[PDB]
Amino acid sequence: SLNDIEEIRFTARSEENLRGVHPDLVRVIRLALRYSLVPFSVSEGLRSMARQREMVRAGSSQTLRSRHLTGHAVDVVAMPAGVVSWEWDYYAQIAVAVRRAARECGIIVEWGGEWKTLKDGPHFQLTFRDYPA
Ligand SMILES: [Cl-]
Ligand SMILES: [Zn+2]
Numbered sequence: 326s327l328n329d330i331e332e333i334r335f336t337a338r339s340e341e342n343l344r345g346v347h348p349d350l351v352r353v354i355r356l357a358l359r360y361s362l363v364p365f366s367v368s369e370g371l372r373s374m375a376r377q378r379e380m381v382r383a384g385s386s387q388t389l390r391s392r393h394l395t396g397h398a399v400d401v402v403a404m405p406a407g408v409v410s411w412e413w414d415y416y417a418q419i420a421v422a423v424r425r426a427a428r429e430c431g432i433i434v435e436w437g438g439e440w441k442t443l444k445d446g447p448h449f450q451l452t453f454r455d456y457p458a
Pocket of ligand 1: 424428
């Protein structure tokens with residue numbers, strides 16, 4: 326399938342799941358697709374209120390307030406060689422690309438890999454300070 330794909334990027338998959346995300350975050354993530362050594366897609370951009378309610382009920386979020394509800398966050402999924410992986414180092418590499426793209430765009434993007442506790446690689450968001458809601 327991918328033997329002749331000299332540089333693997335999941336552009337189309339990502340752009341589809343970026344629909345409805347804040348345009349400034351979209352711009353950063355699109356640039357990060359160019360820079361990342363690790364292919365990735367956006368597995369979740371906009372999240373419904375019902376999904377967030379389900380997460381609160383189940384205990385995977387404390388609050389119904391989520392940056393995903395308003396367009397201010399994405400969860401990425403690492404796709405090395407077209408295969409999903411959850412291994413940390415892939416997400417650290419994606420975050421290098423996001424950090425570069427963000428800097429170039431003059432936008433701070435917070436990464437879940439730098440949460441104070443329970444670090445998790447997929448999550449990126451625009452800050453509440455810069456992008457209130
Ligand atoms: Cl930086
Ligand atoms: Zn997230």
